[PDB]
């Protein structure tokens, strides 16, 4: 019966799933960086620097 | 130029019926976890 703000404490004493939960933050951050740069290249105008 | 109301029609037409089915699946698994009787029932 965890409250909503304590749901991620289930990996507090689970070092395998703490690595998994940090790899998913890493996947989302790197996926943001790849897709933000692809969006920025789609709207960049490189004609007048 | 595309119709601006179609961004609402596609994205709410995707997300709201998808989150309805995610809602139905999650309460199905939570009802099975409550009936199972151990550590996830509470």
């Amino acid at each position: 019966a965890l409250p909503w703000y304590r749901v991620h404490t289930v990996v507090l004493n689970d070092p395998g799933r703490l690595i998994a939960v940090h790899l998913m933050h890493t996947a989302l951050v790197a996926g943001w960086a790849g897709s933000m740069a692809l969006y920025e290249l789609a709207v960049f105008d490189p004609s007048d620097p | 130029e595309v119709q601006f109301g179609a961004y609402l029609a596609v994205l709410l037409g995707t997300f709201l019926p998808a989150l309805f089915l995610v809602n139905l699946f999650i309460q199905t698994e939570a009802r099975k976890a409550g009936k199972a009787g151990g550590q996830d029932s509470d």
Partner: peptide, 30 residues
């Protein structure tokens, strides 16, 4: 700008196919 929506819908569809294959409910006997 609508190609952002078109890409997200196709990539989002392939992510459902990924989870449907590798996170499937395993058929079990008994």
């Amino acid at each position: 700008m609508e190609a952002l929506v078109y890409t997200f819908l196709l990539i989002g569809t392939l992510m459902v196919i990924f989870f449907a294959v590798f996170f499937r409910e395993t058929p079990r006997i008994l």
